[PDB]
Structure formats: C-alpha cells, structure tokens
C-alpha cells in the first residue's frame, strides 16, 4: 500500500470507481460473454449462419470492454491471467483481420476463468484444491512408473500381432457377423481361426479400433495401458489379444494390470485423501 | 538354525531335491534342436545351485541359501522353455499325446519353481509389519 509504482498522482486519476460496485459489472459482463459462447453454433468445415456472424461482431464489443477495464485498472496474481486473456484476445482479433485461426479461437474459452477470479469466496476453494493436490505426489509417481512398466511389457510381448483379419477371398472387405467388431485373426498358429464361409485370414490390416488400440510402438501401447487402467474396455483388448496370439498366456498381463490399477491406485489415493481431510478436520477444530 | 533348521525350510528343500531327481528322470526318460542346450544349461544351473546349497548348512554360511534358490528357480524356468519347444515341435514335426516324459517335466517344473520361490521367501529375513523393524537386521 501507499505506492504509485508507475508515476505520480497526476496519472492515477480514473481510479475512483475501483471501490464502487465494479465487482458486479465486469462480472456481469463476463457472465453475459460466457453466454455469447454457448449460443455459438459450430458448422462443418467453414459454414456459417447469421447468429455466428453477429457473435463475431459482439466479440469486438466484449474485447474492447475488457481492454478498457484493464486500462482503468493498470493505473491504480489473477490479473496476470486476465492480461494473458486480453493479450490472446487482441492477438486473435488482429490476426483475423490481417488476412483481409482456429488455434487462436480455441483460447477464447478461458474467459469463464475471470468469473472464478472475480468472487473471492471461490478462490479460497480453488486454493484448497491445489494445496490438497500436493500429498498425492508419491502416488502419482508410482502410477506413472507402473503405467510405464506395463506399456514396455506390452510393447515387448504383443508388438505387431493384431494385424490380421479374415477378409473375403479376393476382396478387401473385413468379414464380420452382424453385431461383431473387427477382432484380429490368425491362421496356422494358436490364434482363433475364423469361420465366415468366404473368408481368408491375410495380413496388412491397420488395427482393431481403426488402428488406435494396438501395441505397435510406445505411444499406442501407453495409450492402451492407460485405457485399461481406467477399467473401460479392458476386456476388449484382452479379447483382441486372447484370440489373435493364443488364449492361455495373455490373461496375466491384463488381470494383473487391473489388480494393480483397481486395488493399489484406489486404495492409495482414497487413503491419502482421507488422511489429508482428517488433518484438515483437526486443524479446523482444534482452533 | 532359524532359517536352516526350521521345519518349513527343511521340508521345502526336501521337496526341491525330489524336484531335481525328477528333472534328471525327465531329462533321461525319453517317452527342436535347441531342446538340448536349454536342458544342459538347466542341469548346470542345478549343479551350481546345489554346490552352494549344500555348503550353506556347514560353517554357518547360511546367507548362501539366497543365491542357491535362484539357480533352482532358473533351472525350472529353463526346463519350462524346453517344455514349450517340445509342444511346438509337435505342432511342427495324426494324433499325439504327452507320455511319461512330458508329464514328469510338467510336474518337475512346478515343483522346482514353487519350491525355489518358497525357499527364497523363507530365507529372506522378514516382512517388518511394524514401524521399528527392517530387512537386513541382526538375528
């Protein structure tokens, strides 16, 4: 307090409303501007209706009001974020006119953060959340190391198996029954041989989920491991590997992965969270 | 005495020696080409294990029970490999079955392996289960 830090009192003249109800107008404008982003309707590959062309105009009004607010607040922690928002906004607004940009319109969705930065009773809650995110550090490191180990294991064992499925003979149409998904196949091995009547198992196939779930390289393997850790569609990978390379050896990598994602992750996380909440109860009560 | 003459470790070693003799049988009882190198390697592992597993009793050199088990373990872990290279050879070189040789090998693998793991866990000092205990402590 009791500082100018820019220039003498001749400059800080407009700082008379900062103690007026100014915490209810720029907040009202931020809530009117977060509603001008919900009614925007995105259309496929460069189409537009009238309402979007009107919102493109209204964006200028909103940017200018926020810039003049920052201009009446500059001469007088979260204001850092507010200035970053205004900077990105004016950058976008001038770039979209230099051409006469999607990556420059994607940052327009940070505006609602000014709403949390407005009310002070919410920043204490956000700070509590951030402070409680700390004691989970060892658990986070353990989960990262386990995901890495399992990704490397899967990358070693199942590197390039799920690349065969029976097409039709003399055809590039994968052969499946009505409700089946395109699971892998294997001919003259352990893997499942298929029985679609006009079908043959031949290689050159991207992958089960259009090539997204497989163990080819480290990236997709880590992705599949992370997806199995969340217990969503882990039986799908288990089956895609339990019917394309064997049936009695690939059940261990998955079941174990679950028991190391179900037991340990939930137990450790809930334990440390309940412990921190107990310490919070004690530091709030013993006073 | 405590890790060398307790009943559990004693009966486990009594089981693993039977595992070794059945491994010898399954090696000789014959009932693709690398199936012999893995086997002689497992045999050398059994020898290298029993060398330090016999001398672990005397001189109170008990700590050598820790490496010995591993060798036994690896012995089993080697034999299993040969096991597969037999099975695959059947799918490589009609009706087949698994006579004396394969059944004795499938028994010896489990016996040697589980006995070696149990011997390792019986020789390893302790899980603390108390805030003041620790591994590698005096008696």
């Amino acid at each position: 307090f009791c500082l100018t830090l820019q220039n003498p009192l001749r400059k800080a003249c407009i700082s008379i409303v900062e103690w007026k109800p100014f915490e209810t107008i720029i907040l009202l404008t931020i809530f009117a501007n977060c509603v001008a982003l919900a009614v925007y309707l995105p259309m496929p590959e460069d189409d537009n209706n009238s309402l979007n062309l009107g919102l493109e105009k209204l964006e200028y009004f909103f940017l200018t009001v926020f810039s003049i607010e920052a201009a009446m607040k500059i001469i007088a922690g979260w204001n850092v974020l507010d200035f970053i928002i205004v900077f990105l906004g004016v950058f976008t607004a001038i770039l979209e006119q230099v051409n006469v940009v999607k990556a420059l319109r994607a940052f327009r969705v940070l505006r609602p953060l000014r709403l949390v930065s407005g009310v002070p009773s919410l920043q204490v809650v956000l700070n509590s959340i951030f402070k409680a995110m700390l004691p989970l550090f060892h658990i986070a490191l353990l989960v990262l190391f386990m995901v890495i180990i399992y990704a490397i294991i899967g990358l070693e064992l199942f590197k390039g198996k799920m690349h065969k499925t029976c097409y039709y003979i003399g055809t590039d149409i994968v052969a499946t029954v009505e409700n089946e998904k395109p699971s892998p196949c294997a001919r003259t091995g352990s893997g499942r041989p298929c029985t679609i009547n006009g079908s043959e198992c031949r290689g050159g196939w991207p992958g089960p989920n259009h090539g997204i779930t497989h163990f080819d390289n480290f990236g997709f393997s880590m992705l599949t491991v992370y997806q199995c850790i969340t217990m969503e569609g882990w039986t799908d990978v288990l089956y895609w590997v339990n019917d394309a390379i064997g049936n009695e050896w690939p059940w261990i990598y998955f079941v174990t992965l679950i028991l190391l994602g179900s037991f340990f992750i939930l137990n450790l996380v809930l334990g440390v969270l309940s412990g921190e909440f107990t310490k919070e109860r004690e530091k709030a009560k013993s006073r | 005495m405590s890790p060398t003459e307790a009943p559990k470790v004693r009966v486990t070693l009594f089981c693993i020696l039977v595992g070794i003799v059945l491994a010898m049988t399954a090696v000789v009882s014959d009932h693709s080409i690398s199936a012999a190198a893995i086997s002689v390697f497992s045999l050398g592992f059994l020898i290298m294990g029993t060398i330090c597993a016999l001398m672990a009793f005397r001189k109170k050199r008990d700590y050598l029970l820790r490496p010995a088990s591993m060798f036994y373990v690896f012995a089993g872990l080697c034999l299993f490999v040969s096991l597969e290279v037999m099975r695959q050879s059947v799918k490589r070189m009609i009706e087949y079955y698994y006579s004396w040789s394969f059944a004795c090998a499938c028994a010896a693998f489990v016996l040697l392996f589980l006995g070696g793991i149990s011997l390792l866990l019986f020789s390893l000092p302790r899980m603390p289960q108390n805030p003041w205990e620790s591994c590698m402590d005096a008696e």
């Binding site: 999607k102 709403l115 949390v116 190391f145 997204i212 969503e232 288990l238 109860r281 | 899980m127 603390p128």
Partner: protein, 827 residues
C-alpha cells in the same frame, strides 16, 4: 395417530406404484377415485389439525409446512385436468408433482428428519466447491465444442449420438466422459474426426485424458469432503467311555487335517464340465466325491459320539451328500463345503462378525437410498411409460406398420443390400412398470449402459410409437439429476458412514516412540577391514557410482522404449547386460557375498543379472539357428526405487497391511468360487455364437472362463448385456442333450437374481477390503511430519551404525560426537 396416517399414506403409495402400461380400464377407474378420496381425506385431516392446533401453527412448522402445498396442488391438478388439458406430457408432469405427498412418512420419522438436516448441512457447506466443479464442466464443454464441433463429418452411416454439435449435447458428452462410461468411444470419434492415427491427429487424445484425470480428481475432492468434514461432524457432535477320540478331536492333527480335507473337496466341482454330465472325467470326480463325503460323515459321527451353530451347518453339508444319490436343484445346492470353514480356521470368524456388524451400522442411510430409487422409478414410469418401443427400420412408427421385409444396406453402399424381416421390438431395459423402472435405474446407478438409455429416452415419441430423432433434449435432465444424487451423493455419504465409523472403532506421539524406544535394536552396516578391498569398497558405496547406475538404468529404459514395428536392439542390450554384470561382480568383490546377500535389493539384482544373461544366451542361440525371458530387461527399472525415499515407504506401508487381513481377501475368493460353480451349472450349455455377449472368450463352459466372466462383471464391464445374453431362449450348443424341438431352452430368468445379487455382494465386499486397509494404516495416513515420527527415529538408527560397525550393545560415550548430528525434533 401414527398408524391413522400411515394407513392412508401407504394406500396412496400403493395407488402410485400400481400404475403400468396397458393397465385395464378398472385399474384407472380405481386409481383416479382413490386419488380423489385420498385428497379429500387429506383435506379432512389438514382441517382437523388446523382447527385443533391454531392458525399460527401450520406456517412455521417445517415438518408439516407443505401439507397445505399437497392439498392445494392436488386441487389445482384436479381442476386443470378436468378441463381441456392437451399435451399428455402435461398430464404426466401433473401426476409427477403428485408424488410429493408420500413424504409425510419420512417427516414423521424423526431419524429421517435428522438425516435430512445432516445432508442439507453437508450440501450447504459444499455448494461453492460444487459450483466450481460445474464451472469446470462448462469450460470443458466449450473447449469440446471448439475442437470437435461439427467435425464429425463422417461419410458413413453409423450413428454417433455423443458428439459436440451444440451446447446441450456437448454438456451431455462431457458428463459422460466425466462419469467414465464409454468414454473410450467418444475418444475414437474425436481421433478419427481429425486425420486418424497419425502424428497431429492422436494429439487430441489428451483432451480426454485431462478431462478424466483432473475432472475425476475434483469430483473426488468434492464428494469426499462431504464425508470427512460434515458427515464426521454429525458423529462428532453426537459424541459430545466316549474319550477314545476326545483326545485328538481337540489336537492340531485332527483339525489341521479336516481343514485341508475341504480345500481339495471343493476342487471336486471346479474340475467339472457341465455341457455333458457323463464323460470320462465326471465319473472320476464322483468317485472322489464318495471319499470326500465318507471322510466327513466319519468326522461328524466322531463329533456326535462325544457331544449331543456351525455344527448344524456341517451336518447339513454332509447330509446333502447322502441324498446326492427336483433333480437340478439338489445338484446346485451341494456346493456348501467352502462355507463350513469359518468355525475351523478361527480366522474367518472375526471378519464375518465384523462385517455382520458393519451391515448393522449401515441401515438408516440405505433405507432412504432405496426409497429415492423407488421414488425416481415412479417418476420414470410417469414419463417414459411405453415410449421405449421401436420398429426394426426407423421409418415405421407403429406396430401396425412394422411388418413385412425391408432392406439393410452394408457399409452404407446402396448397391449391396439384404432382406431382413422387420419386427416391433420392445427395448431390453424399459420403464413400463416400477419393477422394470427400478431395474433400469439400478443399471443406470452403476454407470454401465446409461448413455444407451439416455439417447433412447431423448428420442421417445408419444406413448406407443417409434423413436423420433432427438425429440426431447430436455429428457437428459432426469438422467443427470439422478446420477448426480443417488449415483453420486448418497453413495459417497454411504461410504463416508463406513469410513467415519472405522475411525471411531479403530496423546498419540508418546504411544509409538515408547515401542520404538524399547523394542528397537542397533543396525548393520558391514564396514570392511583389509584396505586391499576397502579400496574398491569406498567407490562401490560412493554416491556418484549410484548416480551413474541411475543414469544407466534410465538409458536402458529409453533404449527399450525406442523399439517399434516394421539391428540396434540386439547389441545395446548385450552392452547393458555386460555393464550390469560388471556392477554385480564388483559389488560382490567389495562385500565377499557377506554384505551382498544381506540386502534384499542385491538379492533381486542377482536374479535380474542371471535372467538377463540367460536371455542373451538364448538370443545368441536364436541367431545361431521363450518370449517371456525378455521380461528380465524391463524388470531392471524396478530397482529405480532403491532411492525412492517416499515411495518405497508407501509401498511398505500399504503392503504390510494386505498381510494383516488375508481373510477379508478370503471372503472374496469364497464368493467367486461359490458363484462360479452356480454359474457353470445354471447357464453352462448356452451356445458360443459370435456377435453375442456369450462367445468364445466370455462363457461359463470351463471354470476359469466362469471366473473371468465374474471378474469382468465385478470390475464393472457391460454386465447388463451378459445378463440379457443368458436368459431363457438362447440356443443350446449341440454337444448338450435336447430332444429335436427342445433346442431353444438354454438359460433361465434366474439370471436376473444371479447377476444383480453378485453386483451387490461383490461391491459390498470390495468396500470392506478397501476400508479394512484404510483403517489399518490411519497411523501413516494421518502423520504430522514435523512434530515426531518414526522417520526421525529411523534416521537416528541409521546414523547410529555409521560409527558402530556391529551391534556390540551401546558404544563408548565419545560417540556424544554423533549427538551433534541428530535434529532438534529428537535432540
């Protein structure tokens, strides 16, 4: 007066829960007149208590404040419906608001009112955090509308309802990704919406990873701060010549043998094939069962010769074997041997009793949770009654039109068609009656298959017509308000109930250091003499050598990750094996195997070394002329936690507590074993047809496949699809027995009682095992790292042996010189 009002309240609840689709006319004629007479009697009682309690006694009593509301609302609805009231959805919502009157039974119930007060206190405490969560959801919905808005311009005909076209749909998709249901299907659409599995396209897979890792972290911070900070406050404030065998029957011989005599008698049902009951193995299993029942009837008669709770259990399990000799029910009720082990090991006794008292503690919270479900079920029946029908082709909107055959186009190719007969199919999970509605809400509460009901309720047309594409987009509010309460709130406070009780059933610094003071001991360091080898010993234990090994391990990991698909992985591995064998030999030469096989981590190091060497040898043989033997190279990084001071300790803590309750983990194993055999017997002959949920990988044919199916249903996969894949009408596989004509008789509706129950019990059990551990380590979970902790004393222990080579009791008083190294928290 309590019974006087409970009679009419129960009668009104019955008139509510009596409604269903296609009810006879007389049922409606009964329900409407019952509503009328009960509204008039509610008026009579309201006016009686008004004339008997004074005018200024019905507008401040919250407990009976909204009975005037009830009667006035009933009158308003009567007079609005008696006139011309179009929009049958209007009648539906007017009867939805009618369902409020059943809350007098909750209000007069004092304990229920106390629970309402507790819950309202909790929610008024967490309103701000809930608002922050809602704002985060909105921000991510907007970011999704930016990224994938209108980018589902797919040229094919598969429907993708969980897209980001407008704001309500973006909110629905973000909520679905948040609750973790089918979120991996909303990610593949977002990936293929960009290029594909290419470099710039897969990078959109990090919008769904931040939304599920940090969107479920906040969600746990909210609904677990309501149960340690406002639910715990409720309890806190509440606080302020027959002796020839009598000799061994108590000896360890008889007991320890009759214990192991069951674990192999239970395995008589495991090794069984249920497709054909008579083969070359079932005879052997019956022959073994002869002994497995004789050696136990001998036991029970050896018990009866001495004497005259659990003994009757053993008696029944041994009496069913005599009648082993309808016919399919006795065979099912014969796996009872695993139960009668609680009175033998005396380890299951305590866990069974503790869980049977934990069930006792929980009762007033589960009552209201099952009422809320029953409540919502009635609202659903009012909303979606009979609107869940749909023809086979979406172009026919009535059961009169949905006949004949129609064309199905493969791959959306208008030149590759097939004929299929259309049929008016009733959806699997529907809302016709309160039973079916309660079933559907039960499946929704477990989050499995809730979007497929959401996009069916959204499309609901009238009361007996086909689904219209996005007809009602405001129908998702009912599926979002129920998933935010019962499936989110109630469950999180029900777990808080248990957690808080564990703490109660489960100053303090002085109660651990005393044990650490007298029960501890000096430490070993193995400082060697004979400087000849002390030379290499000083660098072997030096810090920069361990830093070098850290770096080499990380380099090995990076070289192990570099591999891809379609000769630099064969030689660098040999180099790394050589360097690590060098490390092994060196540390073996500076410890003479005396201090090498003392530390368990070097015990593990030697294992890794020998395994990697054998792997290199086998690879050499491979190249000259065992896939799992390569796993020993990835194990090399597990020793990275030799320096993990705060992670190895956490693993120690949470591992030494899974060895203190091996019996709570025996309950789950017994549950799986008891349910797998019942499954194998009941539904074991269903044909394995691909495209259905009972296929070559998910079936009850063998025992391991049954256990894997049970594990899948436990961990929370599509269990409600299996539940419909094994219910009375599937094809029996040919290797079974059936007369020509009796082929479509596999499965049975008993499945509904089989799976539901299994999802309750298992869940319950998975709670206990998860909290029995959490309560076991409330020391470590709540440890102030500044006042005093066994970390300080372990540091002191390690500093003690720094000057003291062996134990040798205490040391000379000069090493006071080490007291200058301890910290003020200790000195």
């Amino acid at each position: 007066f309590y019974w006087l009002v409970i009679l009419i309240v129960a009668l009104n609840t019955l008139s509510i829960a009596s409604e269903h689709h296609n009810q006879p006319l007389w049922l409606t004629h009964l329900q409407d007149i019952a509503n009328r007479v009960l509204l008039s009697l509610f008026t009579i009682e309201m006016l009686l208590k008004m004339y008997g309690l004074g005018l200024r006694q019905y507008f401040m009593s919250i407990f009976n404040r909204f009975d005037c509301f009830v009667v006035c609302s009933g009158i308003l609805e009567l007079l609005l419906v008696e006139s011309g009231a179009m929009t049958p959805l209007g009648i539906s919502v007017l009867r939805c608001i009618r369902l409020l009157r059943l809350f007098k039974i909750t209000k007069y119930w004092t304990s229920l009112s106390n629970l309402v007060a507790s819950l309202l206190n909790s929610i008024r405490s967490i309103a701000s955090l809930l608002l922050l969560l809602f704002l985060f959801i909105i921000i991510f919905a907007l970011l999704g509308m930016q990224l994938f808005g209108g980018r589902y311009d797919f040229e094919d005909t598969e429907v993708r309802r969980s897209n980001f076209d407008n704001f309500p749909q973006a909110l629905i998709s973000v909520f679905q990704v948040l609750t973790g249901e089918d979120w991996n299907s909303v990610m593949y659409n977002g990936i293929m919406a960009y290029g594909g599995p290419s470099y710039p396209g897969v990078l959109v897979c990090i919008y769904f990873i931040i939304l599920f890792v940090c969107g479920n972290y906040i969600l746990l911070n909210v609904f677990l701060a309501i149960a340690v900070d406002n639910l715990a406050e409720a309890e806190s404030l509440t606080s302020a010549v027959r002796v020839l065998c009598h000799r061994i029957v108590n000896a360890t011989w008889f007991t320890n043998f009759i214990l192991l005599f069951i674990l192999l008698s239970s395995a008589a049902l495991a090794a069984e094939d249920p497709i054909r009951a008579e083969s070359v193995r079932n005879q052997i299993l019956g022959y073994f069962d002869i002994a497995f029942t004789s050696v136990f009837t001998v036991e029970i008669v050896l018990k009866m010769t001495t004497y005259g709770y659990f003994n009757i259990l053993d008696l029944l399990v041994v009496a069913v074997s005599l009648i082993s000799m309808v016919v399919k029910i006795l065979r099912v009720l014969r796996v009872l041997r695993p139960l009668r082990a609680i009175n033998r090991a005396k380890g299951l006794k305590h866990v069974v009793q503790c869980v049977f008292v934990a069930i006792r503690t929980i009762g007033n919270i589960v009552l209201v949770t099952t009422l809320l479900q029953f409540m919502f079920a009635c609202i659903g029946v009012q909303l979606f009654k009979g609107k869940f029908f749909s023809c086979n082709d979406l172009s026919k909107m009535t059961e009169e039109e949905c006949r004949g055959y129609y064309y199905v186009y493969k791959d959306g190719d208008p030149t590759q068609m097939e004929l299929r007969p259309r049929q008016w199919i009733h959806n699997d999970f529907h809302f016709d009656n309160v039973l079916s509605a309660m079933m559907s809400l039960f499946t929704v509460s477990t989050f499995e298959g809730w979007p497929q009901l959401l996009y069916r309720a959204i499309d609901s047309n009238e009361e007996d017509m086909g689904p219209v594409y996005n007809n009602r987009v405001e129908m998702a509010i009912f599926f979002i308000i129920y998933i935010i309460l019962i499936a989110f709130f109630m469950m999180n406070i029900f777990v808080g109930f248990v957690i808080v009780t564990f703490q109660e059933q489960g100053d303090k610094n002085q109660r651990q250091c005393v044990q650490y003071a007298l029960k501890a001991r000096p430490l070993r360091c193995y400082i060697p003499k004979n400087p000849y080898q002390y030379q290499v010993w000083y660098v072997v234990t030096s810090s920069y050598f361990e830093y070098l090994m850290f770096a080499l391990i990380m380099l090995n990991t990076i070289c192990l990750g570099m591999q891809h698909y379609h000769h630099i992985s064969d030689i660098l591995n040999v180099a790394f094996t050589i360097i690590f064998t060098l490390e092994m030999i060196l540390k073996l030469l500076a410890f003479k195997a005396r201090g090498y096989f003392g530390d368990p981590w070097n015990v593990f190091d030697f294992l890794i070394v020998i395994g990697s060497i054998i792997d290199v040898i086998l690879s050499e043989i491979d190249t000259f002329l065992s896939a799992f033997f390569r796993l020993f190279r990835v194990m090399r990084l597990i020793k990275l936690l030799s320096r993990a001071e705060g992670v190895r300790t956490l693993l120690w803590t949470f591992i030494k507590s899974f060895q203190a309750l091996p019996y709570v983990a025996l309950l789950i194993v017994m549950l799986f074993f008891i349910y797998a055999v019942i499954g194998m017997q009941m539904f074991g002959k269903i044909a394995l047809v691909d495209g259905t949920q009972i296929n070559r990988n998910n079936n009850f044919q063998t025992f391991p496949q049954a256990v894997l199916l049970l594990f899948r249903c436990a961990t929370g996969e599509a269990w409600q699809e299996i539940l419909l894949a094994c219910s009375y009408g599937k094809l029996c596989d040919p290797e079974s027995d059936y007369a020509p004509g009796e082929e479509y008789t596999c499965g049975t509706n008993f499945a509904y009682y089989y799976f539901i129950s299994f999802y309750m019990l298992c869940a319950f059990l998975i709670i206990n095992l998860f909290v029995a551990v959490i309560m076991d380590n409330f020391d470590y979970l709540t440890r102030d790292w500044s006042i005093l902790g066994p970390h300080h004393l372990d540091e002191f222990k390690a500093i003690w042996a720094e000057y003291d080579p062996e134990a040798k009791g205490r040391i000379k008083h000069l090493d006071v010189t080490l007291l200058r190294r301890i910290q003020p928290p200790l000195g």
